[PDB]
Write a protein that binds this ligand. Structure first.
Ligand SMILES: CCCCCCCCCCCCCCCCCC(=O)OC[C@H](COP(=O)([O-])OCC(O)COP(=O)([O-])OC[C@@H](COC(=O)CCCCCCCCCCCCCCCCC)OC(=O)CCCCCCCCCCCCCCCCC)OC(=O)CCCCCCCCCCCCCCCCC
Ligand SMILES: CCCCCCCCCCCCCCCCC[C@@H](O)O[C@H](CO[C@H](O)CCCCCCCCCCCCCCC)COP(=O)(O)OCC[N+](C)(C)C
Ligand SMILES: CCCCCCCC/C=C\CCCCCCCC(=O)OC[C@H](COP(=O)(O)OCCN)OC(=O)CCCCCCC/C=C\CCCCCCCC
Ligand SMILES: CCCCCCCC/C=C\CCCCCCCC(=O)OC[C@H](COP(=O)(O)OCCN)OC(=O)CCCCCCC/C=C\CCCCCCCC
Ligand SMILES: CCCCCCCC/C=C\CCCCCCCC(=O)OC[C@H](COP(=O)(O)OCCN)OC(=O)CCCCCCC/C=C\CCCCCCCC
Ligand SMILES: CCCCCCCC/C=C\CCCCCCCC(=O)O[C@H](COC(=O)CCCCCCC/C=C/CCCCCCCC)COP(=O)(O)OCCN
Lengths: 175, 121, 104, 53, 54, 459, 56, 64, 329
């Protein structure tokens, strides 16, 4: 269905083997499914076509809102409140975006697990690795900020992380 | 602050002439309407005390209370605004005449300011 | 309709007020026994037997058949603890210590 | 009032965040970028304090 | 209910404050109305102020 | 925001100029209209807030509380309509005026851009409820209950004024936006410790914290039905709202100053729940259950994590609705028996079956049955505490267990068994009471369908 | 009957009048804080040919 | 009426500070609080030490 | 397309129609029990088809239809799992319930509130279906609490009897003791695996630690009336015979064993928890059989027989044979 992008939500070909009856006994499954189509799937499709043509009679559009990039907290003065406000709003929007990214990865992982069945432990290694990477990135970015999270606290956390990394690298090089 | 000893102050002036250079308060000022409401409440209490119909005992007396409260409130607002203008004028004059006590702080960016981070756990 | 003087009061110290409290609580003077005079504020109220409400006579025509109480009789301090829906102290065919030893 | 609350416009920007996230993951997967980045702000813009200890 | 809520938690904050305030009020207000003691205390506090805050 | 305040103020001249036999009708109609208007505030943004003016603003945390406060007044009027039948018209108008003033003060309290204005209105709310409790109270202990309720709060809140003026003198402003944006860490100093205590105690005494909760059972037992309603639904949430707003400036001291309080709640939410098992008064039982729930909310606020905050907001809303419903039920029983004791009226399901259904639904909501918002808040706070420390669950679990017990106790003692023989003045339930219970319960199950409206700004 | 029911039902007009008056007060406040209209860095937009203000 | 009044409002006027009541109140009101405080302080200190040492394996711990 | 999903959801959808009609006029007549029984029979004969489809091919599906809410990185949605266990347990449960309601139309003929009794039976059936088909821990907890509260309501059917009330409260007490462990497991899973959806829990836990499985075992012991928490099941005989026959003998009780079956991939990676499960099952079955040996009331004897069977099923769970335990269910 064109309602969603296929690349964002990748799916396997899932080829299905053709029926190969071995005995002469007619399986009731096929009779039940045929009567199911005849009694359910036809009126439903008819009503959907009617509704779709009614919608086609009156078409109107809605658009995705675009946001312009604004200077962030690292290029903000100490007590300048306006640019601080803009940086805080931009940081919050970015935060929501990363939360939705993690949501997409988690949905991918769950779908892989259910689809591959009892071979999931070997057939979903790639999704598990992607989820591990995204989870590590998100935990590094936004964990332990607190209930009153803000851009300055995230910046301070990132700065102390760079301090730790720089000290460790200097010590290893000078070891 | 103690602006009692401010030089060039007339001993008993409610409003000096230099107070006429400021924008007068509007008649629809919320403070004036509040003063009128206080006058109306005073009239209602007066009617209640004398054991009279509270809402409609004397319309003339309630009108007099409202008008007197509005008059005095307008004058009080003028005086208060003038006093605050004087305070700000003295503030700015002093900071202008004493640059050594109010140095310009070097504007520093957050990207070069190290703030300690306390994790919440 | 309740006056000030029939409400529970302080621990009785003289036999006169002891008999007065027994009369207030609708029980015999010889049967009346207040709680000990310690810090806990039991006070005037009588120390009724710790028997549960379940083991009361099921054939007596009580005024409250479900709770098996009579109107006007003194009420146990812990009545809500024994209401036949909670802990009961009815005798059991085997002694308590034997049952505990066997299960343990 | 219940109907009014049910059909409130998405002022919280849920679908906007969904669509932005979809475009970002599509771009980063097409060009090979490693999905989310560990650093929220680029290190080129932070002036770190030299220790010289 | 009885020991903690009805006895000790009531003893600590409310009852202690009430007892202290009642006792202090009794001590402060219990004067016979004699100007003799009043002016004696006036003299004492005058000398205390003279000898203590300078 | 003035579109809500101005009609509430106009409620007073309407009430005072109404006919001698039409005050209730107009009061209820226009209170419901004001609630409908205030429903618009639920539309919130993931961004900062809806900053109406320099004096008022709204947030995703203030919106549910404002909607609940506006919805409460019609219910309080319907509850108070019964027992004020033999009252003079002037005194009924005074009572309605007190209710309207209390609602107005709460409405301007929950917006409160600036902390000193918040304190002014949050202390102004003390007067109408005190007058309600000490004037239209049945018992002779109403005076002592009013004194306790007044003095606990005033003793708690007096150092808060000093702390707030000190904050304004040092930092320079008390506007919440500037306070959040210019927030700075608190150094580990004795001065800062006493600063923290002054800023926190005023709100923690009104939650109420365990050990500071002596005033609540009294103020609940001696108050009339409207007083119990308002003090159980919204006036308890003033402390939680205050702590949620004020904790932005207390970091990182709160990381270790919260230990004495957490314990007091973590143990307290157990102890009071056990108190509920042995109670001879319905009102006292519900008051102690309220203390337990608010102790859990205190734990959630002191943990200071996002899930904790959303759980605390949801629990505040759900507890307010359920407690008001339970107190309405208890008052309906009292107006028939005039005794306010649990063991006198028994077997009421045989006599009043729909009231028995209302009792069952109220108990199930208080029992935190899924998927009600009560359980949503309870579970969120439990998970956040589990992340705080894996051992907490033990206490939490115990409380949950005990909770269910006493709830069903309250359901079984009053409604099941054999009816008491000598009570024969049990008239069939009126339409007014049944409508009150329906208007209490339907919003809970409706909010269950859209939890995001009551999960706070951190959703 | 008009001029008879009015003396009893004029009081129902007060609250809706308060609401509309309330709306006007909110609008008055909005005009004052127009110091940054079409001046925020995020929403800096060139006006339409027949536009004077971004919002009112 | 007597039972309810004795259960509710006749406790404090008949309450006298005694060594038994004082000791029981101190125990039952202070012991549990400090005991739970010690337990939780030890647990959280151990967790903080493990976090600082880096040996905790907090992977996938996103919601807190 | 794919009638599996449509029929599987249609069974649960039509199981709820008489609940909506409970305010209609049919609820005030004597035809309501027959109406509910016919609805249950139709639901069973409709549900017989997806089981046939699975038998032919092995069809399994997850249906995440309604999105309840999203909490940062967690997403809670209305998801139904229709794997082998669900599509096999639904027809058996519906058949048993149909037989029980047909029997109750005779057993409870003299009860003035018979329509309320059938309404309660249908509500319990709906909550059990919700529990069985649940895909995330929140929906499963919803069903877990629904079956328990419906058991409380049905045991105390004669509210004028003190023993019925105390038995119902006892059942609530023991089930809440199990709920402690259930909530511990939910908190652990959302804290560590960052999801309540079963697929993520299965992916992220290759070597499940002791604590979540301990919580699950405690919940299963509480609801299945194991040795530590057994007396509630025999005391739950204060209720009517039809209620005991369906709720306490063959359906609600097996909830704990079913929960342990649902999480069998994680159970097989823990060796201590399996040992505890086996030991608890063995003590439960022997203690209950020993009790049933000398009992004199027939209902109590069959209750102890059911408890012994549940203990045997837990023993099967302990030795890592989940499908055999489901077959025994
Ligand atoms: C942000 C705040 C917003 C609002 C501000 C709040 C205050 C507002 C009002 C302030 C005071 C002004 C009026 C008070 C005068 C007192 C008179 C009185 O008692 O009432 C009788 C009178 C009616 O009775 P009556 O038939 O004439 O004769 C009866 C006798 O008078 C007397 O009858 P009686 O003697 O037979 O009965 C005795 C009774 C009567 O005794 C009393 O009622 C005394 C009055 C209360 C004392 C007020 C003291 C001063 C005000 C303090 C305000 C504090 C605010 C801070 C919050 C804390 C609250 C304590 O006393 C008792 O029952 C004793 C029991 C004690 C109970 C507890 C006491 C609590 C009192 C605290 C009240 C505070 C608020 C008052 C609200 C208004 C009350 C009228 O009431 C009125 O008519 C006045 C009400 C307002 C009139 C509205 C007209 C406007 C409508 C048309 C224009 C539309 C406007 C919009 C414009 C656009 C439209 C086109
Ligand atoms: C009694 C006998 C039975 C008769 C009834 C039989 C029929 C059964 C139907 C009853 C419930 C069955 C469940 C069916 C649910 C369908 C409706 C639901 O899906 O809508 C919800 C909508 O419900 C509302 O969100 C919740 C109601 C609002 C709650 C406010 C309460 C009213 C105000 C009163 C004062 C409040 C006081 C407390 C302070 C807050 C959630 O929808 P959502 O997925 O999201 O999006 C809607 C569609 N969009 C995408 C176009 C927007
Ligand atoms: C931990 C749990 C702590 C126990 C909480 C106690 C709650 C106190 C208040 C309860 C109310 C009192 C009450 O319910 O009344 C007692 C009531 C009536 O007795 P009947 O037998 O029905 O008599 C009927 C014939 N006349 O009986 C009860 O229901 C009380 C039940 C209490 C159970 C306590 C024992 C629980 C022990 C659990 C140990 C097992 C741990 C888990 C093992 C599983 C393996 C992982
Ligand atoms: C230094 C000075 C500190 C001052 C602190 C003031 C605390 C506020 C309460 C003051 C009230 C004291 C007076 C008093 O209560 O008298 C005892 C009085 C005797 O009975 P009467 O009613 O007076 O007799 C009537 C017949 N003639 O007892 C009572 O009635 C008490 C009733 C109200 C109880 C209120 C309890 C309030 C305490 C709660 C905490 C507040 C503490 C505030 C200070 C604590 C320090 C931070
Ligand atoms: C009935 C007669 C009318 C028949 C004509 C209608 C036929 C179907 C057409 C419906 C069109 C589909 C539709 O309603 O829209 C989808 C819409 C969801 O809206 P979205 O915004 O896309 O997602 C939610 C987040 N906002 O779906 C629905 O609302 C209907 C289906 C919901 C499932 C039923 C829910 C019943 C249970 C109530 C909730 C119970 C508590 C919560 C359980 C928690 C479980 C984790
Ligand atoms: C239920 C009743 C509860 C009542 C409230 C209990 C909490 C009491 C809070 C403490 C009282 C004083 C608060 C002061 C307001 C905060 C302002 C502040 O913190 O500024 C400090 C000032 O701090 C103080 O001065 C506080 C001193 C305390 C004096 C009053 C003592 C009151 C009793 C204290 C012990 C009880 C507190 C906890 C009680 C718990 C509730 C029972 C720094 O001032 P500087 O001198 O300029 O800085 C020094 C560097 N140049």
């Amino acid at each position: 269905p064109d309602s969603w992008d296929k690349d964002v939500y990748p799916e396997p070909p899932r080829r299905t083997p053709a029926p190969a009856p071995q005995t002469s006994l007619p399986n009731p499954v096929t009779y039940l499914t045929k009567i199911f189509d005849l009694l359910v799937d036809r009126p439903v499709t008819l009503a959907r076509e009617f509704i779709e043509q009614q919608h086609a009679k009156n078409r109107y559009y809605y658009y995705h809102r675009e946001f312009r990039r604004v200077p962030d907290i690292t290029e903000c003065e100490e007590k300048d409140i306006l640019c601080m406000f803009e940086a805080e709003m931009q940081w919050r929007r970015d935060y929501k975006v990363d939360q939705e990214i993690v949501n997409i990865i988690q949905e991918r992982l769950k779908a892989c697990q259910q689809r591959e069945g009892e071979s999931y432990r070997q057939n979903c290694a790639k999704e598990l690795e992607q989820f591990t990477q995204v989870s590590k990135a998100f935990q590094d970015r936004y964990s332990d900020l607190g209930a009153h999270y803000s851009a300055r606290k995230c910046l301070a956390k990132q700065k102390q992380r760079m301090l730790a990394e720089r000290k460790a690298a200097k010590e290893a090089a000078a070891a | 602050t103690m602006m009692s000893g401010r030089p060039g102050r007339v001993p008993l002036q409610f409003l000096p002439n230099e107070a006429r250079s400021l924008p007068p308060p509007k008649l629809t000022d919320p403070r004036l309407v509040y003063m009128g409401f206080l006058g109306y409440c005073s009239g209602l209490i007066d009617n209640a005390i004398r054991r009279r119909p509270v809402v409609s005992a004397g319309l003339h007396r309630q009108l007099l209370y409202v008008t007197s409260f509005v008059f005095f409130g307008y004058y009080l607002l003028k005086r208060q605004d003038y006093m605050y203008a004087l305070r700000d004028h003295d503030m700015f004059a002093y900071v202008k005449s004493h640059p050594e006590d109010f140095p310009e702080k070097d504007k520093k960016t957050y990207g070069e300011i190290l703030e300690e981070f306390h994790p919440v756990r | 309709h309740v006056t000030k003087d029939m409400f529970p009061g302080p621990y009785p110290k003289t036999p006169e007020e002891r008999a007065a409290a027994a009369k207030k609580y609708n029980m015999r003077v010889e049967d009346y026994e207040p709680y000990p005079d310690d810090g806990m504020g039991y006070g005037d109220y009588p120390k009724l037997p710790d028997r549960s409400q379940q083991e009361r006579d099921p054939w007596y025509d009580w005024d409250h058949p479900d709770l098996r109480l009579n109107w006007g009789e003194p009420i146990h301090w812990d009545l809500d603890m024994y209401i036949r829906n909670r802990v009961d102290t009815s005798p059991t065919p085997v002694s308590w210590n034997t049952m505990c030893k066997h299960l343990f | 009032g219940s109907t009014f609350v049910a059909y409130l416009p998405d002022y919280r920007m849920q679908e906007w965040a969904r669509r932005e996230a979809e475009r970002l993951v599509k771009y980063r997967e097409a060009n090979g970028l490693p999905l989310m980045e560990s650093n929220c702000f680029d290190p080129n813009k932070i002036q770190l304090p030299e220790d010289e200890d | 209910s009885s020991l903690l809520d009805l006895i000790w938690l009531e003893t600590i904050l409310p009852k202690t404050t009430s007892f202290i305030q009642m006792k202090m009020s009794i001590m402060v207000s219990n004067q016979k109305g004699l100007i003799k003691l009043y002016f004696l205390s006036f003299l004492i506090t005058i000398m205390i102020s003279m000898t203590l805050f300078n | 925001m003035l579109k809500i305040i101005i009609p509430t103020t106009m409620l007073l001249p309407m009430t005072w100029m109404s006919k001698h036999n039409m005050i209730w009708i107009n009061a209820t109609v226009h209170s419901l209209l004001i609630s409908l208007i205030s429903l618009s505030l639920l539309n919130q943004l993931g961004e900062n807030s809806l900053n109406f003016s320099l004096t008022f603003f709204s947030d995703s945390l203030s919106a549910p509380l404002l909607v609940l406060t506006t919805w409460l007044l019609p219910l309080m009027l319907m509850a108070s309509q019964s027992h004020l039948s033999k009252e003079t018209t002037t005194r009924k108008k005074l009572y309605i005026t007190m209710l309207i003033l209390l609602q107005l003060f709460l409405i301007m309290t929950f917006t409160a851009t600036e902390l000193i204005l918040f304190y002014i209105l949050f202390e102004a709310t003390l007067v109408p409820t005190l007058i309600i409790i000490t004037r239209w109270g049945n018992q002779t202990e109403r005076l002592n209950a009013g004194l306790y309720f007044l003095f606990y709060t005033l003793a708690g809140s007096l150092p808060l004024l000093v702390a707030l003026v000190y904050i304004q003198n040092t930092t320079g402003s008390l506007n919440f936006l500037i306070i959040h944006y210019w927030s700075h860490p608190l150094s580990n100093s004795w001065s800062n410790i006493f600063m923290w205590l002054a800023c926190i105690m005023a709100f923690m005494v009104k939650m109420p914290l365990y050990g500071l909760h002596l005033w609540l059972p009294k103020a609940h037992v001696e108050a009339p039905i409207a007083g119990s309603m308002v003090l159980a639904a919204v006036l308890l949430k003033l402390g939680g709202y205050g702590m949620m707003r004020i904790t932005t400036i207390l970091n990182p001291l709160t990381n270790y100053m919260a230990y004495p309080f957490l314990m007091l709640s973590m143990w307290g939410m157990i102890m009071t729940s056990s108190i509920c098992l042995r109670q001879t008064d319905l009102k006292s039982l519900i008051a102690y259950s309220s203390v337990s729930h608010m102790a859990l909310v205190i734990v959630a606020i002191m943990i200071q994590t996002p899930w904790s905050f959303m759980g605390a907001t949801a629990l505040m809303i759900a507890h307010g609705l359920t407690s008001s419903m339970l107190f309405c039920l208890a008052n309906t029983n009292y107006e028939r028996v005039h005794s306010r004791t649990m063991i006198l009226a028994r077997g009421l399901q045989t006599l009043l079956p729909l009231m028995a259904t209302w009792w069952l639904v109220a108990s199930l909501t208080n029992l935190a049955l899924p998927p009600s918002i009560n359980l949503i808040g309870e579970l969120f706070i439990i998970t956040a505490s589990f992340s705080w420390s894996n051992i907490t669950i033990i206490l939490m679990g115990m409380n949950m267990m005990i909770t269910a017990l006493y709830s069903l106790y309250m359901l079984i003692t009053t409604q099941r068994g054999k009816y008491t023989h000598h009570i024969n003045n049990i008239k069939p339930s009126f339409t007014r009471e049944n409508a009150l219970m329906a208007l209490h319960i339907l919003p809970l199950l409706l909010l269950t369908l859209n939890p995001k409206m009551i999960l706070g700004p951190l959703y | 009957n008009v001029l008879q029911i009015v003396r009893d039902h004029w009081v129902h007009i007060l609250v809706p009048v308060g609401f509309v008056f309330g709306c006007y007060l909110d609008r008055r406040s909005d005009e004052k804080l127009t110091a940054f209209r079409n001046k925020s860095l995020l929403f800096k937009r060139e006006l339409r040919p027949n536009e004077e203000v971004t919002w009112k | 009426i007597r039972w309810t009044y004795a259960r509710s409002a006749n406790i404090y006027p008949n309450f006298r500070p005694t060594p038994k009541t004082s000791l029981l109140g101190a125990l039952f009101g202070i012991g549990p609080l400090f005991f739970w405080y010690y337990v939780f302080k030890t647990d959280r200190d151990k967790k903080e030490k493990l976090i600082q040492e880096g040996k905790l394996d907090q992977t996938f711990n996103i919601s807190y | 397309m794919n009638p599996f999903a449509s029929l599987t959801l249609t069974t649960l959808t039509i199981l709820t129609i008489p609940i909506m009609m409970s305010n209609s006029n049919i609820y005030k007549t004597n035809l309501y029990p027959n109406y509910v029984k016919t609805t249950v029979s139709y639901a069973f004969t409709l549900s017989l088809v997806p089981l046939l489809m699975f038998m032919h091919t092995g069809q399994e599906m997850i249906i995440s239809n309604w999105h309840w809410m999203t909490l940062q990185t967690v997403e809670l949605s209305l998801s139904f799992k229709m794997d082998y266990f669900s599509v096999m347990f639904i027809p058996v449960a519906l058949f048993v319930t149909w037989s029980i309601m047909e029997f109750s139309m005779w057993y409870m003929h003299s009860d003035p509130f018979i329509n309320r009794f059938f309404k309660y039976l249908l509500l319990f059936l709906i909550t059990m279906m919700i529990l069985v088909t649940a895909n995330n821990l929140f929906q499963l907890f919803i069903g877990w609490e629904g079956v328990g509260i419906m058991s409380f309501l049905l045991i105390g059917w004669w509210h004028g009897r003190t023993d019925a009330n105390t038995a119902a409260l006892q059942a609530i007490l023991y089930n809440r003791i199990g709920d402690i462990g259930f909530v511990l497991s939910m908190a652990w899973f959302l804290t560590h695996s960052n999801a309540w959806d079963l697929q993520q829990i299965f992916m992220l836990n290759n070597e499940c630690p002791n604590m979540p499985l301990i919580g699950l075992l405690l919940a299963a012991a509480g609801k299945s009336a194991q040795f530590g928490l057994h007396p509630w099941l025999p005391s739950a005989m204060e209720g009517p015979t039809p209620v005991s026959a369906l709720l306490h003998s063959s359906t609600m009780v097996v909830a704990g064993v079913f929960l342990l079956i649902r999480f069998y991939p994680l159970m097989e990676t823990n060796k201590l928890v399996q040992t505890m499960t086996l030991c608890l099952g063995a003590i439960t079955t022997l203690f209950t059989a020993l009790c049933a040996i000398t009992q004199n009331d027939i209902k109590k004897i069959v209750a102890f027989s059911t408890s012994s069977q549940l203990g045997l099923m837990m023993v099967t769970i302990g030795i890592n044979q989940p499908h055999l335990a489901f077959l025994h269910i």
